[PDB]
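User: quick one - fold this with adenosine-5'-triphosphate bound?
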Amino acid sequence: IRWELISRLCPNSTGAELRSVCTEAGMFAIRARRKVATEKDFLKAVDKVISGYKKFSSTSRYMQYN
Amino acid sequence: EDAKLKTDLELLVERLKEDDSSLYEASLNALKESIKNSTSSMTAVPKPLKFLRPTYPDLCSIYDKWTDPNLKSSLADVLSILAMTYSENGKHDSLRYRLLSDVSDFEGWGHEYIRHLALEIGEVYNDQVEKDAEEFSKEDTLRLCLDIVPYFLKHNGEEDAVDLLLEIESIDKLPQFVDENTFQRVCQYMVACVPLLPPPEDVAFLKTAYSIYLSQNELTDAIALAVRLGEEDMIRSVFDATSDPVMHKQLAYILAAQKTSFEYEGVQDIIGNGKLSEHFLYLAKELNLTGPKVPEDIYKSHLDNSDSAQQNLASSFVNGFLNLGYCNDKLIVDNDNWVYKTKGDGMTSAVASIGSIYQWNLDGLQQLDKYLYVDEPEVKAGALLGIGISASGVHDGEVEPALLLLQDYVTNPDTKISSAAILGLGIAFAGSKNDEVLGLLLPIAASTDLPIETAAMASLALAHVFVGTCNGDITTSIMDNFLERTAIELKTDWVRFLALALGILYMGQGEQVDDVLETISAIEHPMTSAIEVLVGSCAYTGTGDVLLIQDLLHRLTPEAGIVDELAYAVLGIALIALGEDIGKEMSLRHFGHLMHYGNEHIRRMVPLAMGIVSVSDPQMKVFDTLTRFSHDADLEVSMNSIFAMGLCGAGTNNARLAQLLRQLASYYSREQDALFITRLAQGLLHLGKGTMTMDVFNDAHVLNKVTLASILTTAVGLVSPSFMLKHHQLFYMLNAGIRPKFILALNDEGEPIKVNVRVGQAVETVGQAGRPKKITGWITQSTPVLLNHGERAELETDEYISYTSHIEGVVILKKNPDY
Amino acid sequence: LPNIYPSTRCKLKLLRMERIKDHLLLEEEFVSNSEILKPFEKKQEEEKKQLEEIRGNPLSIGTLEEIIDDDHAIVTSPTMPDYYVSILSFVDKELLEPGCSVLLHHKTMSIVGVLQDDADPMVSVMKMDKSPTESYSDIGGLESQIQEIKESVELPLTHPELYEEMGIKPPKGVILYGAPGTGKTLLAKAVANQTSATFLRIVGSELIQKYLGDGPRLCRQIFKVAGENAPSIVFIDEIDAIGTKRYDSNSGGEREIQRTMLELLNQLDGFDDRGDVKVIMATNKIETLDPALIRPGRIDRKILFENPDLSTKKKILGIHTSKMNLSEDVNLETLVTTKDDLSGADIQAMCTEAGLLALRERRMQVTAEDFKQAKERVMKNKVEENLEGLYL
Ligand SMILES: Nc1ncnc2c1ncn2[C@@H]1O[C@H](COP(=O)(O)OP(=O)(O)OP(=O)(O)O)[C@@H](O)[C@H]1O
Ligand SMILES: [Mg+2]
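Assistant: Sure. Structure tokens for the protein plus adenosine-5'-triphosphate:
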């Protein structure tokens, strides 16, 4: 797996979002019954989490307060 | 009208007592059809049936003066029908009413009356059984059983038919009626009869079910019942009933999982377990478990933190348990100075861990070879012992390298080296009953003029090699070692292992020895009683007889021999109760009550009693009481509790019990012995990264005699755990009864193929009708999975027909053209 | 006692309870023999007599405050002057949690037992004690949302093997945001139907209390109760209520609501490291929610609910009209399956209205005219929409 590519395709996301990306990548393999999650699974998971769940993001408002 | 029906009853009775033959026949037939119509609604005690009660004495009196065989024959049937409400149990009315007349084809009557007559048949058959101690003949009952059985078989009364044939004790007539659609449910309801039904009818049930299966070409269960029976010629007959080679390979896989040495040409590789190593490395590749786990990774001491030799020994044991069968590790393989960190006996287990890691793989012999050249006797003994484990449970057809390399070092004058040699011989050939091993060990073993430790370990090796079916020569040799030795040596802890070795020989059969018990009873040494009860209860293992449990408890109710007999008592009750899970659950409360009122010697086994009974299935209600007794006093009790956790959590990777074990590691850290046994329990908890277990009994309730033998070997002398703390080399005995726990959809050519496998909690098919599912809470899981203790498997896909019905272990598939 | 197989009559069943009685009598015999062997003068049931006479009567009730120098404690009864009560051996020194209800002796006032609360004066309402009704069959369509909720909340509890083997901690929380009246509450009822865990429902309004102090107090109590009765499926509903409304009964105003929300956002994640407490919130207005709550790591899988489509509408019609005393004149195909906009709530509302109207006429069967009248009745009683005019 290419961890550098996965990290690059996830700009300005707090570590909790990376943990959620890992969890969803693990989940997507389970739904397809595969016992090993591959890069194609991680890409789908990171797209879904970072892009799909972007309107419900916290790191863009609270940054102004800091 | 109902009043008109009462008038019909009265007038028909009057015409029956009217002597006219035409009136005789008319009233007889009219009452026959009326009581047939009285059964229009066979419920709520029909009102015509209620009103027939005062009539029954009138029909009886009329029948007494009747002399019409062409008409009284049907009146006998009528009296049989009316005897239902005429309960008066013990009078056996309807049964003798069904006699005399040749109209006993009662199929025209309702299910209620037929059930009632079957119950009366059972009652009067019990009355005949008592009548044949301290009227209808035994052959007389067959006259109606041979009609009732087809009636039940036709009208889905398979359970009722089996019940009736059991109460009549004539189950040998069952196969004459079995249909191609009826056999499966009859057997499924019938294979469960063996554990609970009182002997010796259990063997009769097994043989009858085997006969049913053979005639239906369903050898998948038949091989299992043959293994239960243990008759080798019966397994041979199963083999001769098959012409397709694929079924031969699959039966070979089943009996290799059972570790039973049945010799067959062209198949010997599969039965010899030679393909297990490749299957396991394929499993490791598929589950991505190839990456070895450090014992520190198991400890996780870095997260919980603010003698080096013993901790190194514990780490070596953990590493050996972790990477077992994966043939790769980073702690010991690449670090030769690692062995030197352990001192004394620790060096032996250090090298033995390499053989443990290379188990089932002949590759490991090369790595173990280098440590054989080291002049240190402990290193030589450790490597030599690991040689057997590296090929444990593996038997090529012609020349076992382990036997060739092992036989030279048995006669070594060193006690340690010879002990390791005999231990490795027992490990490698466990459950094989090898004839060359027989002829080597039998003169080498016994030897009442040899060190008692060596003799005891050789006896343990003998017991592991020959499990079940008994053996006269081994028994005579063991009793020769029982001669007197010397009075002090009989008090040593080694004689306990000799007693266990004697006991293991008969564990399979039960109720079959019945003679050595007298021979043991003819000796009046103080230890003899303990050996007697231990062997007697060990033979009965897998049955659940309660009278033996009463005897064992009477022994329990209230000096070294006394300690040993009280020790064997709880192990015996645990083994006997280790049959049906109902006996399991009752034995839990038994051990609880005994722990309530028990002396201090018996205190430090109740944990082990829970552990052996509940091995590889970490049920919730088992380990909480174990945790309660872990913080209790009598440090040996705590050690036993944590080892019972380890056995209970064997291979399940239970994170909850792992957290409990880590907490106990934090607590019992001052006492280094407790820390060492805690780390051993940690290593056993995550054995083989979760792909292997200590399960005593598999699906279809076969008995893995090797696994039980290993568990008893490790639990027999641990009432004094300091002994195995000194001699820890016996802790590798678990590697003899260890087995993988997985599914593998082998193709016809012999390669794994992906397929959907339905996995869920097991449910029995006993009282359910039709075709109910055997799985609750299904998971649509793919090719090889890890079904825990309590789950079966079944093919979701319509295609890929499995030859074996029981989907466990290696499974072969064929492409059904449908869909 | 264990369970009994099989259900019907069978000789093996009789053998099973024969083993039951055999083992039970054997335990009874062992206990009898053990007792008889014991020195009754300090054994058997004389221990009960000694415990009763040492305990004294009546046992008063107080509150524990400390465990200093075990075998000593400072109780605080509501009226007594807070004695320096000593702790006796009979009591279990593991349940003496500071703040429990101990049993003081009457005269000497030494603790002779801990009275467990076992009251739950408010939690009993919260604690789901009987499964509501609907199973997952009653939900028409929504297959993806059901799959997601299952693999998030059910599979971790019933079937942890997949997750532990895969090596991922299960997704912590799920928020069901969507349009009003679209099954966001039904799916919670379904997951409450098949459950092996306690289901403590709470609605966001009840967290807007009146006093300043009891804003975080309620949330702390709810999550503590969820923790002790592990696992828990706490179902905070109408979570947007804290933001909007601005109730007059609330003394603090906005600030107290902010403190309550801060306590909620802590208790969900916490420094305390709570165990198996799954959280399922559902709201109509996901917009007016402070993004601290909906941040990943607190509630991971944010399931979206959408108004049903035509096929989903017909499936909902079929499932809801399954238990109908329907005359054949009614045609389900053109009944409400018209493509002129509906919702998951309208389909059931019109069925209820038509059933009521049929009851009014005492007609046991349902007429197509009544169904049409209820259809138009539901149509008029409908705030249509506002944003469609932008795209109209
Ligand atoms: N797909 C569906 N299948 C079956 N019933 C449905 C479906 N969608 C909605 N319903 C019905 O709609 C009714 C009302 O909707 P419901 O209360 O579930 O909506 P909600 O959006 O969760 O509620 P609220 O907006 O009031 O918080 C429910 O009683 C349910 O029976
Ligand atoms: Mg709702």
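One thing worth noting: Chain B touches chain A at residues 286-288, 756, 780-782 (CB under 8 Å).
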